[PDB]
Amino acid sequence: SMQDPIADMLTRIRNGQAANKAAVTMPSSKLKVAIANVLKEEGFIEDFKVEGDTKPELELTLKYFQGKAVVESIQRVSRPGLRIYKRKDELPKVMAGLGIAVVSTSKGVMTDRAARQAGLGGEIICYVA
Amino acid sequence: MLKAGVHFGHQTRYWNPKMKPFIFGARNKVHIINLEKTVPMFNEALAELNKIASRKGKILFVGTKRAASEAVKDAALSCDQFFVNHRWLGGMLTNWKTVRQSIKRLKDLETQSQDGTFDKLTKKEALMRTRELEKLENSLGGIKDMGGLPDALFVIDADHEHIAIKEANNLGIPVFAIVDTNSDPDGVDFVIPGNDDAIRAVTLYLGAVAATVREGRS
Amino acid sequence: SLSTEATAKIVSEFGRDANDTGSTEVQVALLTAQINHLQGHFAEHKKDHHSRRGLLRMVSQRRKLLDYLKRKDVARYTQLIERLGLRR
RNA sequence: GUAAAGCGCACGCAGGCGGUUUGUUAAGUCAGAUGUGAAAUCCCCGGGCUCAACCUGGGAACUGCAUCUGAUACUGGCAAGCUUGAGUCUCGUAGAGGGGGGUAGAAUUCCAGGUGUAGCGGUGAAAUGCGUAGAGAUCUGGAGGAAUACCGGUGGCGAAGGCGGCCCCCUGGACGAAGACUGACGCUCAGGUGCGAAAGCGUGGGGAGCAAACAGGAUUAGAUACCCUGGUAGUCCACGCCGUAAACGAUGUCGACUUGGAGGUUGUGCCCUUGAGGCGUGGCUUCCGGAGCUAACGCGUUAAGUCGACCGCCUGGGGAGUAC
Ligand SMILES: [Mg+2]
Ligand SMILES: [Mg+2]
Ligand SMILES: [Mg+2]
Ligand SMILES: [Mg+2]
Ligand SMILES: [Mg+2]
Ligand SMILES: [Mg+2]
Ligand SMILES: [Mg+2]
Ligand SMILES: [Mg+2]
Ligand SMILES: [Mg+2]
């Protein structure tokens, strides 16, 4: 079952990007949003929406560049049944910096760089290259 | 459809998920080429063409298809153009260095029986070779005079002249083809969603491009 | 497996409202139905393993429903078991 | 998947993982501080022996544990819900699903009698064998047992193994339809429990055909076989036992994504339904194939593609799935 919601979003993204699709649909959730936000605020997706008041969806728009998709690669990290928490001096650097590491901190779910400089660690999420 | 409203769509239901972004419907059990959005590729296909055409660029025109042949043989004859409508050999582009030589015979043997150098020696001899020329002018007589590698190339429908695009894209020759439904618009960097035959259709677009070609060079 | 009246009957008898068969009570009851009644079809035949396999489903499905109750509410549980003498 | 490797298949305790909203807690988590982490090693910068090895000052580090002060996104606890997961109700549809009891017809074998008379049976030939005590053939009646032609199929059902005439009884699952309802009650599962082709075992029945064993007749250099003529267990039944198979898709269960083509089976919505018919929209299922995957063969929305929860298993061949 959907024991891991986050993973669904990540996977649903790369898969779509591969089949060349405008956006992607999926039931959003509190976290799914914050995560998707970073994906936008960082340059991986045009925008996103959450249709449905009773049952929230997610008009996550996919982004592309030349003859290829922007999202070159994105995999899950702190997956369930195997969580991952790192300290301020532990936060990794996705693709030597050319990538992003979504991390959830007690101050919010931003990128590695932001959370790192802020001086606080947090549970990692994914490594959107 | 601007004016090309004389072919609309074709290819029953075999189609191709790739050519999808170039359809309007499927009435009468067959997809309908979205000529409403084909107009861009239509006249524009000649745009990028006139450019290389102005530089006396060597532009080829393939189309072995029975129906196209008789019409293509004249298409490139607009001026400084070459045509290939008789089974695209496997080397007249990627392995030109070889075929280019086989052409020689075509030249001489032709100019031979063309002038006075033919009715010499024995008859049987000439009689036996008085044909070779023909077969040669078919698979070369149109792309013979070509100095070397063509600046670009324009083929009717991808599928058919599959090899044409292949050998080309390998050298880096622009692909000006008219892919439709079944056709695969991946080998053609210059998408031209349109019928793959229909006399009234082919002719219309045949001499069509030629325009920017002849109008290109000054 | 069961019958219209037989079912509908036990339903209301455990449904605060009507057509609320989803109710945990109605389920536990409806489940035990073919259960404590199929005993006959099994007291004999025996070799009827295929239908046996299913018997367990309505048994286990009923089991989880009970354990669930004990967690979502103590009362209803300790009060429902009695009406059927379940759990010994 | 075929190299070593998916338990033959189910149910399920423990364990692992857990859809969504809010609040609350602040345990995991992170930030800070404080102890403490012996010194010596190690490391950085720097000194001292002619350099170096060696010695040495200071710092870093000692991945850690404990307490205190915060932060609250995320995991957990808790409280209240929420409906899309799961399930219940209703009405239907399809089915070689299962147990039980009858029953029908075709054929085989055997018995009895008629007609009839020199063969038959079998083979590559033959022979053994059955025939003048009258076979074979053919006809009439009878007894008995096992299996159900055609339909029948890329078909259907089942967890697996498996499951075919018809009729009834008892019964399991699956699927659609529009709703009504419960409100995460879920996914997986070591061990455990149960199911398990065929053969085999026990007791007791039954026994037509087929047939291990065994006996003849051939074949052959030999023929403990293939072929022929016979034929015992068994095959069938009830109850109990044994658990194996190329228990094979040689591919664990569950959930979500991902171009297409043709065909099958079964359900439903709408439609001049007038009409076979058109447009859809579910379950299951064949074959072809794109991306990608693959060592290749090949897999390909029923994946061997892209991912997530859980479990089982492999670590060179022979010895050996043997010994103990
Ligand atoms: Mg092998
Ligand atoms: Mg193997
Ligand atoms: Mg298996
Ligand atoms: Mg120390
Ligand atoms: Mg919480
Ligand atoms: Mg047996
Ligand atoms: Mg026996
Ligand atoms: Mg099935
Ligand atoms: Mg295939």
| Cα-to-centroid distance, A46 and ligand 3 (Å) | 46
The H or E element spanning position B83 is strand B82-84
CA pair distance A22, A13, nearest whole angstrom: 11
C-beta of residue A58 within 8 angstroms of C-beta of residue A32: yes
Instruction: Please state the domain count of chain C.
Output: 1
Backbone angles phi, psi at A85, to 5 degrees: -120, 135
Give every CB contact of residue B36 below 8 A, 6+ residues apart in sequence. Answer: B1, B24
Give every CB contact of residue B131 below 8 A, 6+ residues apart in sequence. Answer: none
Residue C84: what residue type?
Answer: L
Q: In the 8-state DSSP scheme, what is residue B180?
A: -
- Calculated CA dihedral for residues A23, A27, A31, A37, nearest 10 degrees: 20
C-beta of residue A77 within 8 angstroms of C-beta of residue A10: no
Q: Report how this structure was experimentally obtained.
A: X-ray
C-beta of residue A33 within 8 angstroms of C-beta of residue A50: yes
Sign of torsion over alpha carbons B85, B88, B94, B97: negative
CA pair distance B168, B99, nearest whole angstrom: 15
**HSE-CB of B56 using CA atoms within 13 angstroms:** 3
Domain residues for the domain of C85 are 1-88
The chains found to touch C (3+ Cβ pairs under 8 angstroms) are none
- C40 C-beta neighbours (distance < 10 Å), count: 9
| Cα-to-centroid distance, C54 and ligand 6 (Å) | 26
| Cα-to-centroid distance, C43 and ligand 6 (Å) | 26
C-alpha closest to that of B194 among B2, B41, B56: B41
- C41 C-beta neighbours (distance < 10 Å), count: 13
Q: Where are the beta strands (DSSP E) in chain A?
A: 23-24, 60-61, 85-86, 102-105, 108-110, 122-126
Where exactly are the structural domains of chain A? 1-71, 72-129
Residue showing tokens 């045509």: B83
User: Following DSSP, what letter does each residue of B25-80 receive, concatenated?
Assistant: B-GGGS-B--TTTHHHHHHHTTHHHHHHHHTT--EEEE--SHHHHHHHHHHGGGTT
Radius of gyration, CA atoms only, chain C: 14
> Which tokens sit at C22?
């989803």
C-alpha closest to that of B69 among B155, B145, B136, B181: B155
Give every CB contact of residue B29 below 8 A, 6+ residues apart in sequence. Answer: B12, B13
Give nearest nucleotide to B16 (CA–C1').
D260
User: Following DSSP, what letter does each residue of C21-87 receive, concatenated?
Assistant: TTSHHHHHHHHHHHHHHHHHHHHS----HHHHHHHHHHHHHHHHHHHHHHHH-HHHHHHHTGGGT--
Domain A1-71 classification at class level: alpha beta
C 21-60: CB within 7 Å of strand D: 21-24, 26-27, 30, 34, 38, 41, 45-58, 60
Backbone angles phi, psi at C26, to 5 degrees: -45, -45
Instruction: Please give the CATH architecture assigned to the domain spanning A72-129.
Output: 2-Layer Sandwich (3.30)
Nucleotides of strand D lying closer than 7 angstroms to a protein CB: 10-13, 16-22, 28-32, 70-75, 82-91, 97-100, 158-161, 170-173, 179-187, 194-196, 239-240, 254-262, 290-291, 305-310
- B74 C-beta neighbours (distance < 10 Å), count: 14
Residue C64 burial by Cβ neighbours in a 10 Å radius (0-12, 13-18, 19+): exposed
- Name the maximum alpha-carbon separation found in chain A: 42
